[PDB]
Amino acid sequence: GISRDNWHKRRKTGGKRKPYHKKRKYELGRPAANTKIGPRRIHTVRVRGGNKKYRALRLDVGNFSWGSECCTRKTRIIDVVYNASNNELVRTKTLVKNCIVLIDSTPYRQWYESHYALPLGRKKGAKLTPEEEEILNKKRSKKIQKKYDERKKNAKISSLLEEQFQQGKLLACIASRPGQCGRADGYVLEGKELEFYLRKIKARKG
Amino acid sequence: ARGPKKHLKRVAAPKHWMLDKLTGVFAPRPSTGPHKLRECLPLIIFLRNRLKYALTGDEVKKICMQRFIKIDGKVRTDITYPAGFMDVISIDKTGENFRLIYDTKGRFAVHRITPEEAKYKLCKVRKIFVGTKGIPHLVTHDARTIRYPDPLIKVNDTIQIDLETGKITDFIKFDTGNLCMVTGGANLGRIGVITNRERHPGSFDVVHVKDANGNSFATRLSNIFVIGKGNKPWISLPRGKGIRLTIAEERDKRLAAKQSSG
Amino acid sequence: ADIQTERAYQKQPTIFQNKKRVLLGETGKEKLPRYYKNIGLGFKTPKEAIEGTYIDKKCPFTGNVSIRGRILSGVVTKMKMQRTIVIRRDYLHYIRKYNRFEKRHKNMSVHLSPCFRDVQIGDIVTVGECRPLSKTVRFNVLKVTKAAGTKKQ
RNA sequence: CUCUGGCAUGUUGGAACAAUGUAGGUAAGGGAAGUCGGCAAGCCGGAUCCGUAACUUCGGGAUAAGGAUUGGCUCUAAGGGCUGGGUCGGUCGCGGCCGGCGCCUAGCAGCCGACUUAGAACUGGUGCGGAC
RNA sequence: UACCUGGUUGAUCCUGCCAGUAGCAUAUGCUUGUCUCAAAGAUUAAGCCAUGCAUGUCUAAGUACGCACGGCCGGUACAGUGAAACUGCGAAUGGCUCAUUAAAUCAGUUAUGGUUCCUUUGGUCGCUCGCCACUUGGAUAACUGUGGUAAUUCUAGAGCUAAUACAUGCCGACGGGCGCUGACCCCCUUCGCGGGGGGGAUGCGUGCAUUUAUCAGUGGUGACUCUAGAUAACCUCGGGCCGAUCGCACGCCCCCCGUGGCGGCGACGACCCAUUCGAACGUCUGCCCUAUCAACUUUCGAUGGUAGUCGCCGUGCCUACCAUGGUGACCACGGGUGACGGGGAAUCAGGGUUCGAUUCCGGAGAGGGAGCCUGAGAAACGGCUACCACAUCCAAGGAAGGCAGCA
RNA sequence: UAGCGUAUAUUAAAGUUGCUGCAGUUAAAAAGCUCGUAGUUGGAUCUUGGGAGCGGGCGUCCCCGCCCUCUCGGCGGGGCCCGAAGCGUUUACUUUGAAAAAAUUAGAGUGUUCAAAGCAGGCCCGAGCCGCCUGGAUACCGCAGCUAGGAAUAAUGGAAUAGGA
RNA sequence: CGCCGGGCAGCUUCCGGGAAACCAAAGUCUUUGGGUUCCGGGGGGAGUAUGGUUGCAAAGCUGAAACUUAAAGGAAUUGACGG
RNA sequence: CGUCGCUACUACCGAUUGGAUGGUUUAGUGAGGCCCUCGGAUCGGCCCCGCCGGGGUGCCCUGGCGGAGCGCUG
Ligand SMILES: [Mg+2]
Ligand SMILES: [Mg+2]
Ligand SMILES: [Mg+2]
Ligand SMILES: [Mg+2]
Ligand SMILES: [Mg+2]
Ligand SMILES: [Mg+2]
Ligand SMILES: [Mg+2]
Ligand SMILES: [Mg+2]
Ligand SMILES: [Mg+2]
Ligand SMILES: [Mg+2]
Ligand SMILES: [Mg+2]
Ligand SMILES: [Mg+2]
Ligand SMILES: [Mg+2]
Ligand SMILES: [Mg+2]
Ligand SMILES: [Mg+2]
Ligand SMILES: [Mg+2]
Ligand SMILES: [Mg+2]
Ligand SMILES: [Mg+2]
Ligand SMILES: [Mg+2]
Ligand SMILES: [Mg+2]
Ligand SMILES: [Mg+2]
């Protein structure tokens, strides 16, 4: 099949190398996983040594990490917006190791409300009446209020992050290897990395 | 090849096995075990070519199936079990135990040991680390691993493992002034006191060691096996006390023994 | 110019760029920590890699490569490639029949990190073996020695 | 093919749609077996990217030979021209005279305008130099 | 044993080759009484093969309701030996040959902190709080019975029957603890406030392994982005582990009692770690003849960079975008080889010159290519699939091939 | 001499391929001449001389000791002591050590009945010997790589507009 | 009339060499190594065939093989012969 | 010594778009395998839900016959 060998290549001098044996199994190559965005389908492939590799053919949920907040939640993938390797993979909507994507901010805002007790992603309020009043007030005692106001002074979110929170979609970078681990784990873009990537999307379109 | 080799040619066999070319094409390919096949001694050649208890491969298998040999206190039914270095081969039917120690000429010897001295074994720690739950682990040259070692033991040190318990009785640190035995290379089977250890970063260290006769010889660090404290060994020694004699003196030693016997 | 001249983003994977910079810490572009490691073997990490801003995953000091194996030496021949140079090693091969030597040379491709900024053609370079960085590169520059230079008129 | 301008089909019309002609096409399978002779017809053909032999008077041969591509639609990239770059009432002809009063100098800011080339995605019953 | 001798001339000194001389290594001729070893279809044809064999295997310890025998000792699950068959393991070693192969293989050296590893050995396996458990489900074998085909180790329909096969799934340890969330309450500096601390009702994860992100710095290297901790989570329905397994003797507790709970020796089986056997790709140096091969590689990766894909992993291994690089008279590239490489063999002053198909190590191949299934390990050929070349039987509808294994 | 002849490949002979070690006026042969990059090869010169008992005998023979620095000396304050760090170049060279499979080669032992071989084997038994003593060495293994000594020969450097110690 | 150095040479010599003719180089060579180029390997075929390259051509440079042969040659010696 | 004349042998040139055998390749067709996306010839489970038996007391324990949901599903 596909070959991972080195002896099919021209040598350093540019000369042509004559192979001394036929294709061996251990230097094989398998077709690209080509992960998509959709309902979870995973194919198990038996690999060298009798172990298993997971082909993430189609993925919908992904375990991402805020990083600066130590908040890691299982969100859903909206759609890939960029890929530094090849722009064709973006419009084909293919998930690879280092493609940046848009993810839902619903679990991230939920942790923000239940921990910091400050509004995030809210425009005017009075829109989640069965719960949001309870989580903002909580009628808690003096010690609990004095615990929440300790973290309120440093519960500050950079402008780029909160703006995407109002958008409902956060720019994240994948870190796992779909087709190898069968997952689409990653982290959330922020800081100079987010500012640089944002200029990349702006130059690409708009 | 397409897979692992399970045959061993007679000439390709290790030299210290003392196998001869004429008896057979093959050799007792040692099974996988605690010791490398290049440095082991399979049990078949122990009971046939050394102790003369059995004549061929079938007879030596008969004792194993009668369950009389207890390598390290455990019954081994493998005809080609790799014994290795400093292992108590105990046959309690004859009440005779052997410690498999190299002799002067770098070959495994028939070193009879007393039953009380046969209840323990020295081992060289090959690496130490910490596993799950912060539990320290230690492995030996005999491939046996123990949990909860004494923190004072570092790598390339010696421990006194106890049979039937698998615990530590005592340990010997590796430093200058300790009695060791070379377990590989040209000086294999020699005993001396550590004099110096030259550290070469990125490469193998070299240890200079001086025997009781004053002859000083070097070797690699991995070939160093400390077997005592100061000058007193912790185990019984084979005949010759681990000295090396140049060809001049064992010649006249043989002549003197022939003269005395004649 | 800067260190961002690619479609990806250059950063050191160990170093976390974002440290939750809030009012308690003056947000005046605080210096991000720089990951560096001593490599052993008596080689000193240069101040260029200590106080630099470049990103190079193949750097012996500020990258994910471990120097192990043979330490060789050579003379710089070509510097016309990105972050790699070609060195020439000259030796004598002995011909037993004639009891005489012959000059033979080998061109070796090594990876030159930008921490060695003032390398020039003809200078001595000591290199260290590592994992295969590219098709023909298996060595990293570890030290640079000038050849009767340091002065230019 | 059309506009301005011109014309009434070239010294007759009508009805039919036989043979034989004259002019023009198509033809299964074969492929010059036809014939003095490939006569006649047919094949090829534009442009882009490759690739081109013998021989040679070294200029040529040469569009040698041979091969791939070509539509529509949606974009992307490159290829230019114009002006303006001031640190300030220290004053008065919200603007004009000199100057203590300044560092674009890796060049920007705005406006304007041709065709041409290259790359990519999508797309059609594989059709695209669609006729000429 | 560091050796010469005849031949050009009428004769002589030379140059110079021819011839002689000795060894070994193939053939061949003549001859051959004994005895000990001992090569042996390599050379041309890695050409073609009839036939026969060369890989199968069970202990007390996975599954016996074959009468195919048999103790029955006779009122009982199975005495025992056990053919057949399922399951497991092996069949990837060996053996043969030297066609291919010229920095390729291979030899020494070194690295894998860049990987996988059946099995052996040693760790680990109540660490996890979560009306079958005194044992759960549906089949398939062999077996009886209907046959079809000219034929093959071809086999269908029908009916049972098993498991360490194939699945499911508890109890138990298990009392709780930890870290979050904290209903509230209490001791409080007490005062008209804060308060310095406790217990905690209610919900959330608790272990190992995997995939990310973050914090600090128990052990170890020469050097970790090492190991080990800490937090937030994920944990893939062709989906990880947390024993629904089998023999050997049989003994202990009897208060609750009198029918249950305990127990030793193993054997098999396991996610993970280490060890062993290794394997794979790398580092440095090293190869015959040829210039009537001087410039090659780069459109189809050539040389590097960035980011990915795949792989067991490191790398243009492949892809996208970039830079124009890389190797050569210190012989690149190309061609030839009647080249497998080496350990070695012959000749023997010294130096060298030839030979190494051949029993040891490494490599490659199984008529030529190619692609795969299973398995830890194969691009396997005494495994499969397709084409090419030969070639077997046919009732012409089909089927079956691989002796460079021993004869 | 139970072996000998022949053919052919190869080795010595062949100092007739010549590095050791050949030739080039006339035998075969130095380019018609010069320049010239690769290649090869390159003048002299930098520590010598003097010392202390051990000493090839101050026994004026000379084993020969030769009459680098700084850090805890691991036997925050003992002289009874000797380890952590670098070389006041880089190499080549030479010596030592480590690691270098076996077989084969040389070579130790061994009456195989001698030998080629092989790795065995020898001693007593008065018969209870209700078994003792051994061997299965060693050398060599190029070149490349590793380690520690020496610094003669050879190459390469330092301070010259002083951006010198 | 001398001396020095660089030249073209000459005479002589048992320096030494060489097969000798002869050579102060053709010496310092089995007592064999100052540095470094080119180049020969019995005689013919043959400086031919073929390939490449140069040239307007004539030709130049590079350059084999099959086959054939026991000598071909060098220097000296004696004789014989000479228009 | 050379031409010419005769006989053998060995290479060379040579029309023949000479022929044959290997090797590497541009272009075109292309078996088979592998992967991916569909595909669903069939084989089962639940929903049973037409009946009857019913049971702690038509409020069924369910043991069966059996329409079948003509759905959810492997
Ligand atoms: Mg008309
Ligand atoms: Mg008209
Ligand atoms: Mg037609
Ligand atoms: Mg037609
Ligand atoms: Mg005709
Ligand atoms: Mg006709
Ligand atoms: Mg015509
Ligand atoms: Mg033409
Ligand atoms: Mg198009
Ligand atoms: Mg061959
Ligand atoms: Mg061989
Ligand atoms: Mg094979
Ligand atoms: Mg298996
Ligand atoms: Mg095959
Ligand atoms: Mg010879
Ligand atoms: Mg000669
Ligand atoms: Mg001449
Ligand atoms: Mg020159
Ligand atoms: Mg000199
Ligand atoms: Mg010279
Ligand atoms: Mg000649």
Query: In whole angstroms, what is the distance from residue B142 CA to residue B183 CA?
Result: 13
Which chain C residues in 7-46 lie under 8 Å from chain A, judged by CB atoms?
7-9, 11, 16-20, 22-24
Pairing of strands B228-229, B224-226: unpaired
Query: In whole angstroms, what is the distance from residue C16 CA to residue A156 CA?
Result: 18
Query: In whole angstroms, what is the distance from residue A73 CA to residue A64 CA?
Result: 6
Contacts of A196 in chain C (CB under 8 A): 4, 9
Whether the CB-CB separation of A170 and A188 falls below 8 Å is answered with: yes
Contacts of A12 in chain C (CB under 8 A): 109, 135-136
Q: Bridge partners of C81?
A: C84
Query: In whole angstroms, what is the distance from residue C23 CA to residue C19 CA?
Result: 12
Query: In whole angstroms, what is the distance from residue C140 CA to residue C152 CA?
Result: 28
Query: In whole angstroms, what is the distance from residue A57 CA to residue A70 CA?
Result: 29
On the CB side of A8, CA atoms within 13 Å amount to: 9
Which residue on chain B is closest to C67 by alpha carbon?
B202
Q: Which amino acid is at B82?
A: P
What string of DSSP letters covers B77-108? --TT-B--SS-EEEETTTTEEEE--B-TTSSB
Query: In whole angstroms, what is the distance from residue B190 CA to residue B104 CA?
Result: 6
Dihedrals φ, ψ of B61, to 5°?
Answer: -65, -30
Query: In whole angstroms, what is the distance from residue B173 CA to residue B228 CA?
Result: 9
- C38 CB inside 7 Å of strand F: no
Cα C51 vs. chain centroid, distance in angstroms?
A: 15
Cα A142 vs. chain centroid, distance in angstroms?
A: 40
Cα A82 vs. chain centroid, distance in angstroms?
A: 12
On the CB side of C83, CA atoms within 13 Å amount to: 14
Pairing of strands B191-198, B111-113: unpaired
Query: In whole angstroms, what is the distance from residue B85 CA to residue B41 CA?
Result: 8
CA B262 – C1' F123 distance (Å)? 9
Which two structure tokens, joined as six digits, stand for B160? 């006194």
Chains that touch C (3 or more CB pairs under 8 A): A, B
**How big is the CA angle at A159 (ends A153 and A161), to the nearest 5 degrees?**
95
Dihedrals φ, ψ of A68, to 5°?
Answer: -70, -10
Q: Which experimental approach was used here?
A: cryo-EM
Query: In whole angstroms, what is the distance from residue B234 CA to residue B237 CA?
Result: 9
A12, A85, A193 member nearest C17 (Cβ): A193
Coil, strand or helix: which one is B247? helix
Pairing of strands A36-37, A41-46: unpaired
Distances (CA, A) of A206 to A89, A160, A162, A164: 20, 18, 22, 17
- DSSP tag of A95: B
On the CB side of C94, CA atoms within 13 Å amount to: 2
CB contact under 8 A, B201 and C68: no
Query: In whole angstroms, what is the distance from residue B180 CA to residue A75 CA?
Result: 62
Pairing of strands B74-75, B69-71: antiparallel
Query: In whole angstroms, what is the distance from residue B38 CA to residue B184 CA?
Result: 10
Q: Taking an 8 Å Cβ-Cβ cutoff, which residues of chain C contact chain B?
A: 40-42, 68, 71
Query: In whole angstroms, what is the distance from residue C91 CA to residue C81 CA?
Result: 25
CA torsion sign for B157, B160, B163, B169 is negative
Nearest to A120 by CA among A72, A165, A171: A165
What string of DSSP letters covers C17-85? S-----TTS--S-PPPP------STTPPPPHHHHS-----TT-TTTSS----S-EEEEEEEEEEETTEE
Domain boundaries, chain A: 1-30, 31-105+169-206, 106-168
- Protein contacts on strand E: list nucleotides below 7 Å from a Cβ: 91-95, 100-105, 110-114, 116-124, 127, 181-185, 194-195, 198, 207-215, 218-225, 227-229, 231-239, 272-287, 296-298, 301-321, 323-334, 351-353, 360-365, 369-372, 374-381
Nearest to B144 by CA among B170, B129, B124: B124
Resolution of the coordinates, Å: 2.6
**Residue C6, C-beta contacts closer than 8 angstroms, at least 6 positions apart:** A84
Which chain B residues in 177-236 lie under 8 Å from chain C, judged by CB atoms?
201-202
Coil, strand or helix: which one is B22? coil
Distances (CA, A) of B158 to B40, B140, B260: 20, 9, 42
Best C14, C17, C20 member to test A by mutation, with max A CBs in 10 Å, is: C20
Which chain C residues in 56-115 lie under 8 Å from chain A, judged by CB atoms?
109
Instruction: Please report where in the chains the tokens 């605690």 appear, as a residue.
Output: B34
What string of DSSP letters covers A190-201? -THHHHHHHHHH
**Residue B87, C-beta contacts closer than 8 angstroms, at least 6 positions apart:** B71, B72, B99, B100, B121, B142
CB contact under 8 A, C17 and A67: no
Whether the CB-CB separation of C17 and C3 falls below 8 Å is answered with: no
Which residue on chain C is closest to A14 by alpha carbon?
C136
Q: Could you say which residues 116-175 of protein chain B have a Cβ atom less than 7 A away from any atom in strand F? A: none
What string of DSSP letters covers B125-158? EEEEEE-GGG-EEEEETTS-EEES--TT--TT-E
- Protein contacts on strand F: list nucleotides below 7 Å from a Cβ: 19, 39-40, 85-87, 90-92, 97-103, 108, 118-120, 123, 133-138, 142-148, 156-158, 160-161, 163
Whether the CB-CB separation of A84 and A103 falls below 8 Å is answered with: no
Angle of the A159-167 helix axis to the A192-204 helix axis, nearest 10: 50
Query: In whole angstroms, what is the distance from residue B87 CA to residue C14 CA?
Result: 48
Whether the CB-CB separation of B34 and B82 falls below 8 Å is answered with: yes
What string of DSSP letters covers B177-231? T-EEEE-SSTTTT-EEEEEEEE--TTS--EEEEE-TTS-EEEEEGGGEEE-EETT
